[PDB]
UniProtKB/Swiss-Prot annotation, chain E:
Phylloquinone binds at residue 106. Chlorophyll a binds at residues 97, 105. It comes from the Eukaryota. This is Photosystem I P700 chlorophyll a apoprotein A1. Belongs to the PsaA/PsaB family. The PsaA/B heterodimer binds the P700 chlorophyll special pair and subsequent electron acceptors. PSI consists of a core antenna complex that captures photons, and an electron transfer chain that converts photonic excitation into a charge separation. The eukaryotic PSI reaction center is composed of at least 11 subunits. It is found in: Plastid, Chloroplast thylakoid membrane. PsaA and PsaB bind P700, the primary electron donor of photosystem I (PSI), as well as the electron acceptors A0, A1 and FX. PSI is a plastocyanin-ferredoxin oxidoreductase, converting photonic excitation into a charge separation, which transfers an electron from the donor P700 chlorophyll pair to the spectroscopically characterized acceptors A0, A1, FX, FA and FB in turn. Oxidized P700 is reduced on the lumenal side of the thylakoid membrane by plastocyanin. It comes from Physcomitrium patens.
Swiss-Prot record, chain F:
Pfam families: PsaA_PsaB. One of its GO terms (biological process) is photosynthesis. [4Fe-4S] cluster binds at residues 557, 566. Chlorophyll a B3 binds at residues 660, 668. Gene3D superfamilies: Photosystem I PsaA/PsaB. The keyword rRNA processing does not apply. One of its GO terms (cellular component) is photosystem I. The lineage of its organism: Eukaryota, Viridiplantae, Streptophyta, Embryophyta, Bryophyta. This is Photosystem I P700 chlorophyll a apoprotein A2. Disulfide bonds: none annotated. Belongs to the PsaA/PsaB family. PANTHER family: OUTER MEMBRANE PROTEIN, OMPA-RELATED (PTHR30128), PHOTOSYSTEM I P700 CHLOROPHYLL A APOPROTEIN A1-RELATED (PTHR30128:SF19). The gene is psaB. It comes from the Eukaryota. The chain crosses the membrane at residues 44-67, 133-156, 173-197, 271-289, 328-351, 367-393, 415-437, 515-533, 573-594, 641-663, 705-725.
Length: 91, 160, 63, 192, 164, 732
């Protein structure tokens, strides 16, 4: 039971890991891997207008670069773990 | 093992011994008892009774068909089904592979190497067919010394 | 030119039948402008049945 | 010097602490792989030397071995008895989320060091007794990997004793061995 | 030569239908037994006039009904006819390897095998080659005639010995 | 610019070959003249849309014929004693015995009995009446019409997508795993839960009562509150009759395992949970690659970073992302390799674990459905290997793939071909020698002298699954294993009851004949892999001919010189391995149909005594089951298997007709057609008629293709007939 506390703590734990623990691990990997590259150029550089990386949606005011996509990524793992926990407890 | 009864206590294996002699006994009914073709069927029956008493005494496993099944996993009871005659085979098959390999090395350093393969040099052949007796000590000996394998720089390779 | 007459060479030409094979040089042409002057004889024939082929000195090394 | 007379390889010169030249399969032959293997051999060993007192001293005080004190999480109710006392916060989603937060913050801060020597032995806050800033420095690092490899072999022993004899612990394997030592050995596992 | 090679197949087709018509025609209308009061019971009584006009009768009342003595001859004196019936099917399907394939595929497969021999220093000086195109067709038609003719030999010599 | 207009070099051909090759080079879009990247990808995209429209216009007519001329409601009332009707027959060539004999299933006229398992499928999924199938047929007519509109739309210059959109592999994988594999299996789960489970429990849920018929007693409350076990609370009992409310439960997502005890089929609550699991895991796996939002993966740097530092893989996978993304034949070969391994995983898991209600009882339908996916999978896997060969000729760049794993396959290609050759030769001598030995011992009156090998490895795997027949008792058959105690409260009460039953096909009792034919199967896969790996790796060149890449993929030969170069091309290795897949899948489906045709009538001892030697295969399977096949029509009369008796003979025509193209070769027929051209040009009253195409013989590649296609059509029709006439005429 206790859906309102289990989901909130598990999302807040994965967002704590996403902001303070694994954020140098994630920011290094999105720069080392970079954008996807076909034949030496970016997909947007090759002519795909739909492959342009959005910057208004990625314009974050967090001082460590933690954006709303990382909210939608690390918080999605916190609900996947949070519903893993709730299904395991309620058995 | 694997749901198979032993053939010495298998009722289906004893049924096949009963219906094989009975087939041969009915073949014997139309011959004279001292005739020459009746001695062949009488030798066939004693060959059959020797066979069924040999299969049951070796710890063979018989299924629901009354037939002896071989366990080739490497069981300590079942070594003579696959492991013991497999090591007997591979020794003989490696003997064939070692004296044919050593013959080709002995005729490659000859004046006409292609006339020694259509016309096999029997004094050269028989002096190494004896030498194929001790071939695991000579194959791994050539493997450890590097003489068994050829380096890829001296091997004819088709282009990419 | 050439490595030597009567010497053992190994063919580096990819499309030859005798690639990475021991061959014996029988003739090197010293005339200028010849692309493949070194004539190498092999103990084994190819599928055409010949053993005589001409290679450049860049496609052979001494072995 | 893991074998007297054996030629030590060119990538193992002996200047490293515990460089006894033991690499028959050549796993550390790559230079950049070998720098990761040196900081992997020490974290493993330090976790193993935190594990041998974590196995024997719970067993010698009578609170079970390291297996029967670990099966409570698979049970829906185990209550997490620590030193004979059930902790109130000892639930499986509670203690795993702390372990996936506290250790992950510790291991991410460990991996952030760019120096390949401070990754091995950091010092400073992790050396408050000042033995690193002392007269002996080389032999204590040799003491680290000789004690560490002993506990690494010990934890390998610890694990495969539980697979071979389930329901028993390493001091209970020691007490079984101390009664009739010429009958109950690894040959009971080798020869069934 | 290739026309002789194809005429060998058409000789198989011609002569095989000739001996099939022979075997069915006289097992149905000639060969049999005579009981009392002049009644003639043939081996396959009167079915040549009605079943040998369709290919299903030829497959059914000749190739299936009369092959009920070449396949259950096992455990008897005619079991070598069953063994050579099956091995004749083997030689026929072995012929289809040589007939349908060509030389260059087998030459490059032999080149891979020669590479494996060069690796272990067991290269023969007589170079392994694929069979020639005339030779591959000859080997294929030899196994086709041998396997099919041995199939008909085994089926005939089991059936008409069994019912004779 | 005549036909064909895509190739200028074939339009100037004055012969019949221009008519032929334009049919066969019609979809080889990259070999066309004046041909570019954008036109390649857009024509392939619209051809995909046309393929989707053909599939949906096929399903629409297979639904329309069941709804119109089939007794789907009468099969829904009694699925055990009613034959499923495919479609009606209107043949002007029937006599009155043929009309009176093809009238089956209580129909008003001559009808065809459906052996495609569409009735079992549509019953399990929720379709009950003919009006529901008609509405599905109209809906899929609309869906195929929408795909035709979308295919026409993307060839218009306003909506043409560029090659950079086509080569966007990360966005394609994210929206395929998230959308195609995730939201469609979650859509499915919404069907299976909303419609198929209440139609199994008698409740009629349609579009009119979708928003009112609650799928659970407490729906979407326990889902969002976390207690998901409420959805596994009250499962269907063992007294549940399918389609009726009595004996039913309320749980929508169970984890029971095993089979429904009345249908011998999988539980719709389990398949609903199965799809919610392969839906959560595919939507989560679809958030992997980087498209537009900063997070994700670039697969180029994944393949670049996956290099072993010891140099055993060379450069690893560096340069492989551009190699796959630039080569359409690499992507198509990977897709067909995965598709063959899953069309065969389809075949292996719908006979042993029947997923559709009353499919296990209908025997010939199950036989057709196994043989279907094993032949479609042995042509899809060979297409994968053939496309690997076409990649190595017209798409593999050795400069871009420098010392990576793909270049290192060419570096040691003789080792791979020679070791596949050794494995094929090992399996062939051993399997043939053991079958011929067992044949000799049954011939020589001694069945006991056979080398019979109990397949104890796969029997150990069956005992590892829970089969207590062999008595190995290691794990899931012994109660002392942790896997059993982790499973005995969760799924194993269904699974052990399903696997310890001896009437079903779930992990059958195997014997020495199964061992021997599994080595026949390994022989077939190994030799087909031998020819196909040999074609793919000697595609660019070999020691006989080093410039095979500059002659294209499907070139005939290289001439009689250098010994002879017949079948030297990689297409010819594909050609020679179509015979090997036909032989392989023939062995596979022979083993399936005889292991099951003896299981279904009870006497498994016939297979256990007779499958170890090939005279048992010839006599007790090929001869014994063909008793009512070839007696489908007689001089006395004709039965309902008569169409299957003609289709059997028809196969023996077409297959043997292929021999005419596979044995006799071109120049005989070219001189024959030269004499025919003289005869037409000199015959009075017929010389007036001219040809515009010059009559020539079939060309060499075309001859091998025509003989191969005839061989394949005869092979699939001889076995489709025998297999659907030796199980449907002797049911059991
Ligand atoms: C002189 C002895 C000799 C040696 C040591 C080997 C050893 C080798 N051969 Mg073999 N082979 C030989 C004779 C030899 N062969 C001859 C005479 C033929 C023509 C029949 C071939 C045809 C051949 C094929 C078709 C294949 C091999 C391959 C192999 C390898 C595995 C063994 C195998 O497949 O079973 C042996 C295979 C046979 C077909 C049996 C032939 C062996 C004969 C009976 C020995 C005769 C020797 C005697 C002195 C004359 C190994 C490298 C495989 C490979 O590519 O390497 C992995 C493979 O595909 N060989
Ligand atoms: C998604 C599956 C798929 C796709 C679209 C491709 C795509 C293509 N294949 Mg492929 N292929 C595959 C699977 C598929 N194939 C399978 C299933 C097989 C095994 C039977 C092959 C075997 C095959 C060969 C080996 C050849 C192609 C070639 C081609 C081209 C079409 C040639 C054409 O117009 O044929 C038209 C064909 C006919 C009119 C004959 C059909 C008659 C039937 C069988 C009766 C095109 C690149 C050719 C190519 O790329 O040329 C270099 C080529 O040579 N394919
Ligand atoms: C969520 C978004 C979305 C979704 C739904 C799809 C959907 C699809 N795209 Mg697409 N794509 C997208 C966005 C999307 N894409 C993006 C953003 C990119 C840009 C890079 C592309 C670019 C792209 C290309 C360029 C191509 C596709 C194609 C396709 C089709 C795949 C072929 C097909 O129908 O097989 C259907 C396959 C499945 C349903 C998956 C089934 C998986 C296995 C094989 C079967 C398992 C199912 C189960 C066991 C069977 C039971 C059923 C049985 C009872 C009958 C499919 C309609 C191709 C096509 O056909 O074009 C028309 C094509 O050419 N798309
Ligand atoms: C893409 C998949 C899909 C879609 C379109 C729907 C659509 C619907 N579901 Mg549903 N369902 C699905 C997945 C799907 N289902 C799966 C994954 C489950 C299994 C857990 C169920 C089980 C479920 C329950 C048990 C109920 C619905 C209900 C609903 C309805 C309203 C949902 C709402 O209020 O929010 C709607 C018809 C609710 C309803 O009122 O239906 C009548 C309801 O309570 N769903
Ligand atoms: C009793 C009957 C018997 C007979 C007739 C055969 C027949 C054959 N076997 Mg087989 N086999 C048998 C017993 C039998 N096997 C047993 C009991 C074993 C178990 C160990 C095997 C395992 C086996 C192996 C491992 C190999 C043979 C090979 C051979 C073939 C070539 C051997 C040769 O000339 O050496 C050629 C020279 C060699 C060096 C190869 C020998 C393998 C070395 C020793 C390893 C030959 C056709 C080969 C085969 O079929 O694969 C192509 C082969 O590789 N067999
Ligand atoms: C009964 C018929 C039959 C037989 C036995 C052969 C024989 C064989 N096939 Mg196949 N094949 C056949 C028909 C058959 N095939 C037909 C119809 C075609 C279609 C055109 C092909 C085309 C062909 C190709 C394309 C390939 C094979 C290969 C081979 C070998 C497979 C390895 C093996 O099993 O060694 C065991 C040997 C036997 C079972 C023959 C036993 C004969 C005994 C020793 C006589 C005493 C072997 C020589 C492959 C090969 O040679 O590589 C190794 C190869 O790549 N086959
Ligand atoms: C290269 C040859 C080869 C290949 C392709 C196969 C292929 C097959 N065998 Mg195996 N097996 C082989 C030789 C081989 N076997 C030999 C030499 C033996 C001793 C006679 C066995 C004994 C064996 C048994 C007892 C069973 C199989 C089974 C199987 C399957 C699973 C794989 C397995 O257990 O292999 C294991 C492979 C080995 C032990 C040897 C590998 C090859 C060496 C080097 C020769 C597969 C269909 C199962 C089966 O038929 O399913 C019903 C089964 O249970 N195999
Ligand atoms: C006993 C210890 C044995 C260690 C020997 C291993 C050793 O010698 O390393 C050799 C090789 C490592 O090569 P890499 O180039 O990856 O690594 C360079 C090494 O020097 C490590 O630094 O490993 C293997 O080939 C993998 C063998 C295990 C294969 C695992 C297969 C997994 C299957 C899928 C699951
Ligand atoms: C501290 C701080 C702050 C705040 C922040 C916050 C408050 C945050 C929150 C956050 C959040 C609030 C987040 C959330 C997120 C969420 C999400 C993102 C979700 C998702 C989900 C998912 C996706 C799931 C899934 C699923 C499903 C649907 C079903 C099936 C199962 C699963 C579970 C898988 C600020 C800025 C002021 C600044 C200062 C500091
Ligand atoms: C030439 C070429 C190609 C092709 C190739 C091919 C076609 C191949 C195939 C291959 C294949 C087709 C393969 C498959 C594979 C699979 C596998 C390998 C599987 C495995 C599995 C596993 C390992 C799993 C596991 C397990 C088990 C076993 C039991 C229990 C459960 C589990 C899950 C745990 C391409 C196109 C690329 C291009 C280039 C060239
Ligand atoms: C298989 C095959 C080959 C290869 C056939 C070969 C290499 C013949 C093999 C003959 C024997 C088996 C090898 C020589 C045997 C030696 C006498 C050594 C004895 C070893 C054992 C037999 C004892 C072709 O060359 C060919 C050419 C044209 C169309 C089709 C085909 C074709 O199908
Ligand atoms: S034309 Fe025919 S016979 Fe002549 S080389 Fe080509 S494939 Fe061989």
């Amino acid at each position: 039971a206790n859906t309102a506390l289990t989901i909130t703590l598990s999302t807040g734990a994965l967002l704590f890991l996403g902001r303070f623990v694994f954020l140098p691990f994630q920011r290094d990997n999105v720069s080392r891997q970079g954008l996807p590259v076909q034949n030496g150029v970016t997909h947007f550089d090759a002519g795909d207008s739909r492959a342009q990386e959005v910057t208004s949606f990625l314009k974050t005011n967090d001082p460590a670069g933690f954006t709303i996509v990382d909210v939608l990524a690390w918080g999605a793992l916190g609900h996947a773990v949070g519903f893993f926990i709730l299904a395991t407890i309620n058995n | 093992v694997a749901g198979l009864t032993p053939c010495k206590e298998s009722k289906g294996f004893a049924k096949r011994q009963k219906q094989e002699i009975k087939k041969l006994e009915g073949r014997l009914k139309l011959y004279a008892p001292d005739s020459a073709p009746a001695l062949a069927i009488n030798a066939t029956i004693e060959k059959t009774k020797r066979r069924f008493e040999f299969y049951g005494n070796q710890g063979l496993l018989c299924g629901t068909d009354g037939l002896p099944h071989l366990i080739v996993d490497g069981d300590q009871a079942h070594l003579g089904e696959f492991v013991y005659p497999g090591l007997v085979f591979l020794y003989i098959a490696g003997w064939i592979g070692w004296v044919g390999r050593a013959y080709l090395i002995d005729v490659r350093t000859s004046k006409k190497p292609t006339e020694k393969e259509i016309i096999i040099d029997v004094p050269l052949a028989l002096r190494i067919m004896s030498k194929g007796l001790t071939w695991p000590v000579a194959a791994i000996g050539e493997l450890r010394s590097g003489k068994l394998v050829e380096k890829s720089s001296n091997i004819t390779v088709s282009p990419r | 030119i050439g490595p030597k007459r009567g010497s053992i060479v190994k063919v580096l030409r990819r499309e030859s039948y005798w690639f990475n094979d021991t061959g014996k040089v029988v003739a090197v042409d010293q005339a200028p402008g010849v692309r493949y002057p070194v004539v190498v004889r092999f103990d084994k024939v190819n599928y055409a049945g010949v053993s005589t082929n001409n290679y450049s000195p860049d496609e052979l090394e001494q072995s | 010097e893991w074998l007297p007379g054996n030629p030590r390889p060119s990538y193992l010169d002996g200047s490293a602490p515990g460089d006894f030249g033991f690499d028959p399969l050549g796993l550390g032959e790559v230079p950049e792989n070998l720098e990761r293997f040196k900081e992997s051999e020490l974290i493993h060993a330090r976790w193993a030397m935190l594990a041998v007192p974590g196995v024997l001293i719970p067993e010698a005080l009578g609170y079970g071995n390291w297996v029967s004190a670990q099966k409570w999480a698979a049970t829906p109710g185990g209550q997490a008895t620590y030193l004979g006392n059930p902790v109130p916060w000892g639930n499986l989603p509670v203690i795993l989320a702390i372990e996936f937060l506290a250790i992950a913050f510790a291991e991410s801060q460990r991996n952030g060091e760019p120096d390949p020597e401070k990754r091995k032995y950091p010092g400073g806050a992790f050396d408050p007794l000042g033995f690193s800033k002392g007269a002996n420095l080389e032999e204590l690092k040799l003491k680290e990997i000789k004690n560490g490899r002993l506990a690494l072999v010990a934890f390998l022993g610890f694990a495969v004793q539980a697979i071979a004899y389930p329901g028993t612990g390493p001091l209970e394997n020691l007490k079984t061995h101390l009664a009739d030592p010429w009958h109950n050995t690894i040959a009971h596992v080798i020869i069934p | 030569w290739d026309h002789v090679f194809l005429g060998l197949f058409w000789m198989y087709n011609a002569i095989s239908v000739v001996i099939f018509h022979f075997s069915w025609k006289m097992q149905s209308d000639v060969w049999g037994s005579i009981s009392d009061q002049g009644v003639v019971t043939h081996i396959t009584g009167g079915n040549f006039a009605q079943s040998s006009i369709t290919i299903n009768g030829w497959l059914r009342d000749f190739l299936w009904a009369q092959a009920s003595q070449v396949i259950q001859s096992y455990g008897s004196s005619l079991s070598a006819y069953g063994l050579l019936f099956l091995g004749a099917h083997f030689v026929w399907a072995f012929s289809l390897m040589f007939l349908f394939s060509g030389r260059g595929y087998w030459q490059e497969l032999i080149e891979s095998i020669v590479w494996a021999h060069n690796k272990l220093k067991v290269a023969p000086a007589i170079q392994p080659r694929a069979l020639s195109i005339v030779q591959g067709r000859a080997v294929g038609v030899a196994h086709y005639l041998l396997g099919g003719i041995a199939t008909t030999w085994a089926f005939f010599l089991a059936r008409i010995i069994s019912v004779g | 610019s005549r036909f064909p207009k895509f190739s200028r070099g074939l339009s100037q051909d004055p012969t019949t070959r221009r008519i032929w090759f334009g049919i066969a080079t019609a979809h080889d879009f990259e070999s066309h003249d004046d041909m570019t990247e954008e036109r390649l990808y857009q024509k392939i995209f619209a051809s995909h849309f046309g393929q989707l429209a053909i599939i949906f216009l096929w399903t629409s007519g297979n639904l329309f014929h069941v709804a119109w001329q089939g007794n789907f409601e009468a099969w829904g009332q009694d699925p055990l004693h009613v034959r499923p009707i495919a479609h009606a027959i209107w043949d002007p060539h029937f006599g009155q015995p043929a009309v009176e004999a093809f009238t089956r299933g209580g129909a008003s006229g001559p009808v065809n009995i459906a052996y495609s398992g569409v009735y079992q499928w549509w019953y399990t999924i929720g379709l009950r009446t003919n009006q529901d199938l008609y509405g599905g047929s109209i809906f899929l007519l609309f869906v195929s019409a929408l795909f035709l509109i979308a295919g026409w739309l993307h060839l218009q210059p306003k909506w043409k997508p560029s090659v950079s959109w086509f080569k966007n592999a990360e966005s394609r994988l994210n929206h395929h795993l998230s959308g195609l594999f995730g939201v469609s299996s979650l859509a499915w789960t919404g069907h299976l839960v909303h419609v198929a489970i209440p139609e199994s429990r008698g409740e009629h849920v349609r579009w009119n009562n979708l928003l009112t018929a609650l799928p659970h007693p407490q729906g979407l409350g326990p889902f969002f509150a976390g207690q998901w076990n409420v959805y596994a609370q009250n499962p269907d009992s063992n007294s549940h009759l399918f389609g009726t409310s009595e004996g039913a439960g309320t749980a929508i997502l169970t984890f029971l395992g095993g089979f429904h005890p009345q249908t011998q089929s999988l539980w719709l609550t389990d398949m609903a949970h199965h799809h919610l699991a392969i839906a959560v895991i595919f939507i989560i796996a679809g958030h992997m690659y980087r498209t537009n939002f900063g997070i994700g993966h670039s697969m180029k740097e994944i393949l670049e970073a996956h290099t072993p530092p010891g140099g055993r893989l060379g450069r690893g996978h560096k340069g492989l992302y551009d190699t796959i993304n630039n080569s359409l034949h690499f992507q198509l070969g990977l897709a067909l390799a995965s598709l063959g391994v899953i069309t065969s995983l389809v075949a292996q898991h719908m006979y042993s674990l029947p997923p559709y209600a009353f499919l296990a009882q209908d025997f010939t339908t199950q036989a057709a459905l196994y043989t279907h996916h094993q032949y479609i999978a042995g042509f899809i896997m060979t297409g994968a290997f053939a496309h690997g060969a076409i990649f190595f000729i017209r798409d593999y760049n050795p400069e871009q793939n420098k010392d990576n794993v793909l270049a290192r396959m060419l570096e040691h290609k003789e080792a791979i071909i020679s070791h596949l050759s050794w494995a094929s030769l090992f399996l062939g001598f051993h399997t043939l020698g053991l079958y011929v030995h067992n044949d000799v011992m049954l011939a020589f009156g001694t069945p006991e002298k056979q080398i019979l090998i109990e397949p104890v490895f796969a029997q150990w795997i069956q005992s590892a699954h829970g089969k207590a027949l062999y008595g190995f008792d290691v794990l899931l058959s012994s109660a002392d294993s942790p896997a059993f105690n982790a499973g005995q409260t969760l799924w194993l009460p269904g699974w052990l009851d399903a696997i310890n039953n001896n009437s079903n096909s779930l992990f059958l009792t195997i014997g020495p004949g199964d061992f021997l034919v599994h080595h026949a199967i390994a022989l077939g896969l190994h030799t087909t892999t031998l020819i196909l790996v040999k074609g793919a790796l000697d595609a660019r060149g070999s020691k006989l001919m080093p410039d095979k890449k500059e002659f294209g993929y499907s070139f005939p030969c290289d001439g009689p010189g250098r010994g002879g170069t017949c079948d030297i091309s990689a297409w010819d290795a594909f050609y020679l391995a179509v015979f090997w897949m036909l032989n392989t899948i023939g062995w596979v489906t022979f083993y399936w149909h005889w292991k099951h045709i003896t299981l279904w009538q009870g006497n498994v001892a016939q297979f256990n005594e007779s499958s170890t030697y090939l005279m048992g295969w010839l006599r007790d399977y090929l001869w014994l089951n063909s008793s009512q096949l070839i007696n489908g029509y007689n001089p006395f009369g004709m039965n309902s298997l008569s169409v299957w008796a003609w289709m059997f003979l028809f196969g023996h025509l077409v297959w043997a007709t292929g021999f005419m193209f596979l044995i006799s070769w071109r120049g005989y027929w070219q001189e024959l057609i030269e004499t025919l051209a003289w005869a037409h040009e000199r015959t009075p009253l017929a010389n007036l008629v001219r040809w515009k195409d010059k009559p020539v013989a079939l060309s060499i590649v075309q001859a091998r293709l025509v003989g191969l296609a005839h061989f394949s059509v005869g092979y699939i029709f001889t076995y489709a007939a025998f297999l659907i006439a030796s199980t449907s005429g002797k049911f059991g």
